[PDB]
Scaffold this active site. Structure first.
Site, PDB file in Angstrom:
ATOM      1  CG  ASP A 132      -0.441  -0.318   2.613  1.00  0.00           C
ATOM      2  OD1 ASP A 132       0.661  -0.761   2.836  1.00  0.00           O
ATOM      3  OD2 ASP A 132      -1.160   0.126   3.535  1.00  0.00           O
ATOM      4  CB  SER A 133       3.804   2.738  -1.918  1.00  0.00           C
ATOM      5  OG  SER A 133       4.480   2.307  -0.613  1.00  0.00           O
TER       6      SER A 133
END
Ligand SMILES: [Mg+2]
Ligand SMILES: [Zn+2]
Lengths: 303, 195, 120, 99, 80, 358, 109, 49
Positions: D65-66
């Site tokens: 979750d970047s």
């Protein structure tokens, strides 16, 4: 200055202009320096590891950047985690860091004796896509140009493609083997892509349900969580560490990750709202199954 | 005399905008100046969609390097598809698949919870808007110009910038600074300017 | 004396409101007093007395600047703005029939706020 | 998680922000009513933007979750704003003086 | 605080057509509304307002980004 | 040889057939015609050209072409004279930066002076921008309808130094010139993507890993060109883009033809079985030059051992690695032939631009 | 603060010790350096070069960590490893003194 | 001899007899309702226990 036994700011050291034996100079961190890298809570032995410094000269960047495969050491993600970093300055501390606290020592878990690093999410699905036999367009091949494009960004010594015509079609297993030949290992295991629960539905390609590597020549199956995934016991990186060392295992992890990432860069991957939408016949079948569940529940109620 | 002046302290340069020396409750004056910071979306600032998917922004790609669809549409954010299946945040995907049709029709729709929803009918609305049944489109890799083999799901998803800035939270202290008088150790935290 | 009074008065919201109404009616410059000499002018025009005169006597809320248009409170946004400022002044000086006038102006402001909500 | 993040979200934090002197407050210049809005937006101002999001793999920089952000979207004003701080100090007594 | 000068995503200058679009949208809402208060417009279950043709007449292409950022961006003058 | 075939030019015009648009335009702007500057859409067809060259042209036109901005000189925003509390310098500077201008002279300095002498919330428009510098504008360089920030009653905003700043869209996005509107390969067959069985695919009947398209259609949109000089503006843009690419390729050629004096950009190694490895490093280079060089080298040396580049987002550089079964001089001369091929095809593109659009 | 109380139950100069050294034929500790011992030797030599600077390497190196590491690898480390687990009440220290130039070297790679 | 803190927006708040534009020019949010207390340069909300 040892002669004065005092520290000096270089703003006033213009006239001295030189150093001498026995002087201590405090210099800025540079690429190649070793730095300790930690994340609270520090629960595991690998919570504090020594990484090599890569200084990002772009001033707009203020984050600590580290490979996704390195998260397994610190149990970190990039949802907002903050991590400590201190660069050793003493000579003893630097020697100790680079000889004992280097993250290669923590590639094999002290807890479960297995590997902790590997391919996660992106690189796992990328290796699966790269190593499979057929795409929706047919055979999973690439010309010489795109085979070279795969090895563009692995930082290794690129292999020799002088034997391939510009119209020659290289298989995905071919390029994976040209990467794995540098650390030849033997691996034979079913992939996580093959599951008996799925088997009745969807037609598994018989060339994908068995992964076989002989001396670095991947000629069978696909590469997925079982073979390259992080924390997979007996995976190819575990064998690479056993045979050639954890440092070579980390190098191979990075190289295979780059292969998968470039193959997806040219193959694309996405999830859509219609990927999770059932067909109307399937929706009626789901309704029927749930109705049967509720029917036997109501039979219990009737009893 | 003696000095009790106030030092700025913060590494990030600021701008002053406050002309006020108020008259406090104890009938005494005090400074009360206000500092203004120019805050774009830096690499490391957190963003999140209305379905609760946090994400730290780590890539600054120029407009040419961004992937683009066949008809010139490119994304502002590129989020990993792997963020969905474990969290089951299907509200974000349905919001995207409705926002595509809404943007094409120039409308705004209510997506309140527990309102009747039909994913099949929303996708057929996409189809009648001229796009594919799914929101997928033909995208080209921005860096190399090659098209991806797989049609990519791209659409307008409402996104929020959570107020946890990198410039506030980053800290780096040299080999010297304020020390605790009692134990001779550095003071605690960024606020104390050491430790 | 004059210094603390200047600080306190400059910091009241009422001073800002009266000064901006004076700026609208072109009695005080739209600059903010660049040098003390024009600051005295702005204080005199906004409040009605020089600060020494304010300290001298004990009745301060009435001679505040009043709009020099006397709008026919019977272009709509101009009417609303100036009537709102007049009602603010009336509240500050405690004009006799402030409550019913505030009620009817609240009704008018409600209508105008509805019509501004249409634009939103 | 959304109930938390929407309250953490930067936006028009106060309609009278210039008159105030608030410590650590961020005023996001541009806000948008969501293309898919809810009943909550009748009563509160939306905080955020209708960013175009591509759910795709691009170089692996968005793993775990970047988010990969267009630099042009940053430059044009997306999620930009002003961040405020205040420094106030009072004299201990008449002994002190500013200068 | 206003419709952006250019579409954030792509940079097409929707800001040229903004000021015209606010007034045109207000006029179109006036005709498409009914016995419904302005604060209840985003609540009407029998109300449908499509700005597709209006934006097209403004010359803005069939772009998701530009139309999104045109029709959705909040105006500070409307709320303050 | 006609690499660049026919080109369609279509400005984006205001449709006064809608009553709402006409009424609004005449009500606030007194606008009865099209604007002085219109966003034009240019759709171009290329034949017999590698995808790398077309995409490099597209990228250069998008951001890498030196373009002009409106900006505020430091100190131009008069803090003392600007009364409005909501119009910060950052917000107004951001609004003014991204006004797409068609500037022919770089000395035009504009000023903003807006006093709200009334009780209404006055809106500043782009017509409020007053030019006091350089030759008098006989044609506006921006539309007079752009909404710069408003003003609260009784408040004033004064900006006295608004100048024209040159830059490239890569460093700052306000210099972005073109926005993409189309890109498609005309030689590759396409599936009917409307069907269920093909909706999940790109549509092209060939994989990207094996395709080598040679017939493209690149569609670009330019944000503001003068209404009576659309074709000349488009030609200036396209010729400028070709010129920039030729200049950068020639800059690379400058170090290429210097196979001695080991400048820290070219390093040549002869290794193992009489193979030559050539590494080229250029700081602040992008995928345009890298992909062009790789494609044309691979065209020139089909049996090359390895040619590849990498533009890492950090290190801000292009590193091109060429390995070939030839001596250093032979490899250098082959790569010089490739560079001359790139130069030649872009000169051909410029000439065809002039021939076609005119 | 209340200590939650389970309240559980249970010549200031030490006599000098004579360093007795086990003869080389009775040493039972492994003849291969532990990674701890190798790391300690490299660190001690590297710091000693940092303070003194003299070296016995025929190849020039620009960093003390490299000189010390190569000295360990080429088996010319001027330091003995004293391995000691014994202190008798009789005032005697029993140690094994190992020459790293004869011990095998761990991986360190 | 006593002073009792006044909640913003209550019938003993000065804004209770100010119009929305009057609040705008004073320095209050015209749209915010109130319901908090101002004490020593801060704003405090007495929550529902
Ligand atoms: Mg986390
Ligand atoms: Zn757009």
């Amino acid at each position: 200055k040892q002669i004065t036994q005092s520290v000096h700011d270089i703003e006033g050291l213009k006239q001295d202009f030189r150093l001498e034996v026995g002087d201590i100079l405090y210099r800025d961190v540079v690429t190649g320096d070793v730095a300790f890298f930690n994340r609270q809570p520090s629960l595991e032995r690998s919570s504090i590891g020594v990484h090599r410094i890569v200084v990002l000269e772009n001033p707009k960047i203020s984050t600590f950047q580290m490979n996704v495969s390195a998260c397994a050491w610190y149990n970190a993600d990039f949802d907002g985690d903050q991590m400590n970093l201190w660069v050793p300055w003493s000579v003893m501390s630097r020697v100790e860091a680079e000889l004992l606290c280097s993250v290669r020592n923590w590639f094999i878990s002290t807890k479960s004796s297995g590997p902790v690093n590997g391919q996660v999410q992106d690189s796992t699905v990328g290796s699966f896509l790269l190593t499979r036999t057929n795409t929706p367009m047919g055979k999973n091949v690439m010309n010489k140009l795109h085979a070279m494009g795969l090895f563009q960004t692995t930082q290794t010594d690129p292999p020799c493609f002088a034997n391939y015509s510009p119209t020659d079609l290289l298989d995905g297993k071919s390029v994976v083997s040209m990467l794995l030949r540098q650390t030849p290992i033997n691996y034979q295991r079913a992939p996580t892509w093959y599951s008996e629960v799925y088997a009745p539905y969807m037609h598994y390609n018989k060339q994908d349900i068995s992964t076989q590597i002989r001396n670095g020549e991947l000629i069978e199956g696909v590469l997925d969580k079982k073979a390259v995934g992080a924390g997979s016991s007996g995976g190819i990186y575990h064998l690479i560490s056993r045979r050639y060392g954890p440092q070579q295992a980390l190098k191979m992890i990075f190289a295979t990750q780059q292969l998968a990432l470039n193959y997806v860069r040219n193959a694309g991957f996405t999830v859509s709202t219609a990927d999770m939408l059932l067909t109307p016949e399937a929706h009626q079948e789901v309704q029927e199954i749930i109705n049967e569940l509720l029917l036997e529940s109501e039979e219990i109620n009737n009893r | 005399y003696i000095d009790r002046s106030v030092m700025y302290g913060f590494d990030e340069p600021a701008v002053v905008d406050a002309v006020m020396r108020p008259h406090g409750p104890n009938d005494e004056i005090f400074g009360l100046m206000r500092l203004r910071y120019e805050r774009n979306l830096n690499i490391g600032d957190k963003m999140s969609s209305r379905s609760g998917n946090k994400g730290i922004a780590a890539l600054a790609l120029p407009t040419s390097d961004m992937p683009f669809t066949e008809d010139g549409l490119q994304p502002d954010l590129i989020v990993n598809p792997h963020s969905h299946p474990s969290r089951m945040t299907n509200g974000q995907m349905i919001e995207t698949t409705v926002g595509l049709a809404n943007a094409l029709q120039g409308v705004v729709t209510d997506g309140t919870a527990f309102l009747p929803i039909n994913v099949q009918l929303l996708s057929e609305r996409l189809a009648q808007e001229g796009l594919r049944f799914n929101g997928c489109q033909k995208m080209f890799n921005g860096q190399t110009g090659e098209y991806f083999d797989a049609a990519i799901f791209i659409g307008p998803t409402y996104h929020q910038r959570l107020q946890k800035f990198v410039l506030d939270d980053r800290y780096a202290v040299a080999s010297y600074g304020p020390t605790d008088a009692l134990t001779g150790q550095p003071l605690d935290g960024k606020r104390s300017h050491g430790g | 004396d004059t210094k603390v009074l200047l600080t306190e008065i400059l910091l009241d919201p009422m001073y800002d409101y009266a000064a901006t109404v004076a700026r609208i009616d072109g009695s005080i410059p739209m600059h903010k007093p660049r040098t003390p000499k024009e600051a005295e002018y702005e204080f005199k025009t906004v409040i009605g007395r020089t600060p020494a005169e304010l300290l001298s006597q004990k009745e301060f809320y009435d001679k505040i600047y009043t709009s020099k248009y006397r709008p026919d409170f019977t272009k709509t946004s101009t009417l609303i703005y100036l009537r709102a400022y007049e009602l603010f002044l009336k509240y500050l000086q405690n004009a006799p029939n402030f409550n019913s006038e505030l009620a009817e102006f609240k009704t008018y402001e409600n209508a105008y706020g509805e019509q501004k909500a249409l634009l939103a | 998680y959304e109930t938390n993040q929407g309250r953490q979200t930067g936006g028009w934090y106060c309609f009278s922000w210039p008159y105030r002197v608030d410590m650590n407050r961020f005023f996001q210049f541009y806000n948008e009513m969501p293309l898919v809005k809810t009943i909550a937006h009748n009563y509160v101002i939306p905080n955020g933007l209708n960013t175009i999001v591509a759910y795709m793999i691009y170089g692996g920089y968005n793993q775990e979750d970047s988010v990969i952000v267009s630099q042009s979207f940053i430059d044009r004003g997306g999620f930009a704003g002003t961040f405020y701080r205040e420094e106030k100090v009072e004299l201990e007594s008449d002994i002190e003086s500013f200068g | 605080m206003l419709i952006p000068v250019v579409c954030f995503t792509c940079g097409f200058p929707i800001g040229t057509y903004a000021a015209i679009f606010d007034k045109a949208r207000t006029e179109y809402i006036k005709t498409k509304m009914g016995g419904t208060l302005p604060q209840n417009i985003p609540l009407d279950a029998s109300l449908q307002i499509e700005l597709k043709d209006l934006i097209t007449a403004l010359g803005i292409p069939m772009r998701v980004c530009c139309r999104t950022h045109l029709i959705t961006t909040l105006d500070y003058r409307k709320y303050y | 040889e006609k690499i660049f075939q026919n080109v369609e030019i279509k400005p984006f015009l205001i449709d006064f057939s809608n009553l709402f648009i006409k009424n609004a335009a005449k009500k606030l702007f007194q606008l009865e015609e099209q604007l002085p500057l219109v966003p034009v859409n240019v759709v171009m067809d290329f034949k017999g050209i590698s995808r790398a060259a077309v995409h490099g042209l597209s990228r250069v036109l998008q951001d890498e072409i030196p373009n002009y901005m409106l900006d505020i000189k430091p100190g131009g925003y008069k803090i003392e004279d600007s009364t409005d509390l909501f119009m910060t310098e950052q917000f107004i500077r951001n609004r003014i930066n991204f006004i797409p201008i068609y500037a022919k002279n770089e000395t035009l300095v504009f000023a903003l002076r807006s006093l709200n002498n009334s009780c209404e919330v006055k809106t500043i428009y782009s017509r409020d921008l007053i030019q006091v510098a350089g030759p008098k504008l006989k044609y506006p360089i921006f539309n007079p309808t752009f909404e710069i920030g408003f003003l609260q009653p009784g408040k004033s905003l004064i900006i006295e130094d608004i100048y024209i700043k040159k830059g490239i869209g890569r460093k700052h996005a306000a210099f972005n010139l073109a926005v993409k509107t189309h890109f498609s390969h005309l030689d590759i067959e396409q599936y009917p993507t409307d069907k269920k069985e093909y909706m999940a695919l790109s549509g092209y009947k060939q994989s990207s890993m094996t395709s080598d398209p040679r017939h493209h259609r690149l569609g670009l949109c330019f944000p503001a060109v003068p209404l009576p000089h659309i074709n000349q503006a488009v030609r200036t843009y396209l010729k400028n883009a070709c010129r920039i690419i030729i200049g950068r390729i020639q800059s690379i050629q400058k170090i290429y033809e210097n196979f001695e004096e080991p400048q820290p950009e070219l390093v040549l190694f002869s290794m193992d079985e009489e193979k030559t490895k050539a590494i080229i490093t250029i700081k602040d280079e992008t995928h345009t030059i890298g992909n062009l060089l790789k494609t044309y080298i691979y065209e020139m040396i089909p049996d090359i051992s390895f040619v590849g580049y990498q533009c890492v987002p950090h290190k801000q550089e292009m590193v091109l690695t060429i390995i070939h079964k030839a001596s250093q001089e032979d490899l250098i001369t082959l790569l010089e032939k490739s560079i001359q091929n790139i130069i030649q095809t872009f000169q051909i593109l410029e000439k065809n631009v002039d021939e076609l659009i005119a | 603060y209340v200590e939650t109380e389970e309240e559980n139950l249970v010549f200031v100069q030490a006599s000098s010790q004579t360093l007795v050294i086990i003869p080389d034929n009775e040493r039972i500790t492994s003849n291969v350096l532990t990674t701890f011992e190798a790391t300690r030797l490299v660190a001690v030599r590297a710091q000693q070069l940092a303070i003194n600077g003299s070296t016995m390497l025929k190849k020039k190196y620009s960093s003390p960590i490299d000189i010390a590491k190569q000295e360990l690898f080429n088996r010319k480390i001027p330091l003995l490893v004293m391995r000691c687990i014994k202190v008798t009440p009789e005032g005697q220290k029993i140690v094994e003194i190992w020459n790293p130039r004869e011990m095998g070297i761990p991986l360190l790679d | 001899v006593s002073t009792f803190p006044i909640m913003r927006g209550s019938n003993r708040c000065h804004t209770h007899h100010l119009s929305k534009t009057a609040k705008k020019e004073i320095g209050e949010d015209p749209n915010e309702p109130g319901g908090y207390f101002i004490a020593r340069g801060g704003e405090w909300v007495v929550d529902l226990l």
